[PDB]
Design a protein around this nucleic acid. Structure first.
Lengths: 169, 102, 64
RNA sequence: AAAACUUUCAGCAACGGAUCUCUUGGCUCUCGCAUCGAUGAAGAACGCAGCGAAAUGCGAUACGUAAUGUGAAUUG
RNA sequence: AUGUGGAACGGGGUAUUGUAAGCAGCUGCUGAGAUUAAGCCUUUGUUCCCAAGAUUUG
RNA sequence: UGGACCCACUAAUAGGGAGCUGGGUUCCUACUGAUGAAG
RNA sequence: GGAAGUCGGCAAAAUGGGAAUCGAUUCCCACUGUCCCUAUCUACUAUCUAGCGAAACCACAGCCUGGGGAACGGGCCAGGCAAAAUCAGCGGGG
RNA sequence: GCAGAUCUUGGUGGAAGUAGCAAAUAUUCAAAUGAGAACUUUGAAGACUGAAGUGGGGAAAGGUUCCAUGUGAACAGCAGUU
RNA sequence: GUUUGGGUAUAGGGGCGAAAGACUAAUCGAACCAUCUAGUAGCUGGUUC
RNA sequence: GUACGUGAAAUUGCUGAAAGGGAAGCAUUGGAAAUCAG
């Protein structure tokens, strides 16, 4: 299936997708935004550390009521949290993405998360005693790829002066 | 690596002022944290006998000082992972100094 | 595994309360396999499941 | 005075089910016919298939039998 | 990140209560015993642990 | 100012502008503290 | 110290009670954090965290001063001013 | 031929990961199953209802909720191997 | 320090009520249901290039 | 790819470009970048 981005080509990329996951869309976006651009091994260390409460996921956009912490000072913000369910899902997709990369035959050392994205899923209706306790599932996909990095004219006056200057030189 | 030591814990100072309904559970939490910070481990298993010793006087009363036997035994699931096993020691006067058990 | 039904049957055959039913902790496999009342009575005879005795109201201090 | 955040624009991906096309349905008009029941009606109930819950059909001869016509199926 | 290093206990001082259990013969041990830092002081005491992992920086 | 116009204290008990109760009729913004990226 | 608070012993303490007048009122005694005058202690909530997760309301929004004939208002006029992102309070402004 | 009708039907937002989660004192240790255990099972310990029960039975009412096996899609404002 | 289970009777400007102008299936400006009804509009709000 | 014809808007995520000191929107003129055309 086509993704949000031009990459996922066979040249450098590996794909992973998870749809209709019982994870909060706001927390999923925070984890995706944090881990985007990281190396694959660095992302694994980060997610393990978030699980163990040693580093935290900064809550940039959906930061209403989020408490402050010292662990967010490595990203230049004060509001950070430790969403464990989103980390579990992202870790599973990252493991699947690495496995697909090994199957494709890529170099595991240079792999970085080129494109990670979270989208909202069809909301799930549940009742509250009346109102609704709507769930907000997430569509998450991951693209990991190994890192890789004047015809001006001249007027008659302009060129004639330039030629004269060259003759003087 | 595999060692065994007899420590004494000052429980009087580790739950000074704590709520009476949480004395015994926080006692277990302090014991496992005490074992972790001593043997430099992660998995710490509490002997049911020591749990009995903690809860003998009720959830609201814990002895001021307890004699523990911390053994940094090798785990039975991974031979490179190691854990601590904490069992109580029955001594007459708990105010004795830490020693090393053969 | 799960031993709700085994405990219920054990209380039924012992004619006591399931609070007093004592089920051996290090023979879980054999106890779990024992599923019918005939097997439960077999466990009773072998001593794997024992009926805990009653407690007391201590008439001793009541008389005192 | 860079990021993040907010907003605007564009590509892609989502959410949602509009639009376009269709349609064994509906609506309207016209024409033709006169046929329920104590010989048990309309209706209701309960059942019936090799594997059926509903719909349809049927009634212990039960997703039917007899008779007539067709002529080689039924179908998951 | 090997130091007048830290930590866990132990001793002492200082405090709170009031003279413990036991041994005994109210009395003696016995101003004893118990507690003492959890936001008290001290330590030639013992034991233990650290010259590590990650992140951002012209 | 303290008490039931009254009587004390007091140096004095001066006059006015811009949360509450009794007897009487039958979100955001402000304020206050707390962080915080950045030449 | 002992109702000095309040329209007033509302509520607690005395264990509620003694005498008068018509259950009420008054008086004297008695008691007390109502008060001078607040301080301390405990539990829960609030705080943070993991999970779950709404609703009211919603033209757009959001600083003040003087003026805008009025209705002065947040948009207009003239000024003071004006630097991201936020957290916990209190509720002035609807 | 729609911008309104506190219009109809459907869908979606900001508030917002915010308000908040239930009364009914209270859980802890080990082991087993299991991908996964604060919540499942057993043992041990600590508690509670305290015969006017968190006990055992029935009438009305419900109708297969009963029991075994299996599942963990959806439901059990957390979770779940239940 | 009479209450109540079941059976039955009373039905709508009716019944019932130690009387509150109360109850009569979360409704008593006058029970609920369906038709007359697409009721009555001096009035309000909208009425499309 | 059955959550299945076509698949709009509101709304959301990512990428790229740009702006931002208590509003934002819009209009007029022109610069800057991008793009098309004679």
């Amino acid at each position: 299936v086509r993704y949000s981005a031009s990459p996922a080509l066979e040249t450098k990329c590996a794909k992973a997708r998870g749809a209709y996951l019982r994870t909060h869309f706001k927390n999923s976006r925070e984890v995706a935004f944090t881990i985007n651009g990281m190396s694959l091994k660095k992302a694994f260390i980060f997610l393990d550390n978030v699980k163990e409460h040693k580093q935290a996921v900064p809550f940039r956009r959906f930061n209403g009521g989020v408490g402050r912490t010292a662990q967010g000072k490595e990203f230049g913000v004060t509001q950070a949290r430790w969403p464990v369910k989103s980390v579990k899902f992202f870790y599973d997709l990252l493991k699947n993405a690495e496995a697909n990369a090994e199957a494709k035959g890529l170099d595991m050392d240079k792999l970085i998360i080129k494109h990670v994205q979270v989208n909202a899923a069809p909301k799930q209706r549940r009742r509250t005693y009346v109102t609704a306790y709507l769930s907000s599932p997430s569509h998450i996909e991951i693209i990991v790829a190994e890192e890789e990095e004047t015809v001006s004219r001249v007027s008659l006056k302009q060129g004639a002066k330039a030629r004269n200057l060259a003759a003087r030189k | 690596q595999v060692v065994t030591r007899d420590y004494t814990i000052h429980m009087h100072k580790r739950l000074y002022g704590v709520s009476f309904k949480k004395r015994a559970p926080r006692a277990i939490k302090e014991i496992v944290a005490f074992a972790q910070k001593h043997m430099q481990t992660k998995e710490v298993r509490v002997d049911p006998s020591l749990n009995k010793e903690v809860w003998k006087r009720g959830i609201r009363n814990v002895p001021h000082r307890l004699r523990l036997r911390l053994s940094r035994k090798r785990s039975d699931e991974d031979d490179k992972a190691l854990y601590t096993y904490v069992q109580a020691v029955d001594v007459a006067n708990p105010k004795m100094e830490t020693t090393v058990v053969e | 595994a799960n031993l709700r039904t085994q405990k219920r049957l054990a209380a039924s055959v012992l004619k006591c309360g399931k609070r007093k039913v004592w089920m051996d902790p290090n023979e879980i496999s054999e106890i779990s396999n024992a599923n019918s009342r005939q097997n439960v009575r077999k466990l009773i005879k072998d001593g794997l499941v024992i009926r805990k005795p009653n407690l007391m109201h201590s008439r001793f201090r009541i008389r005192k």
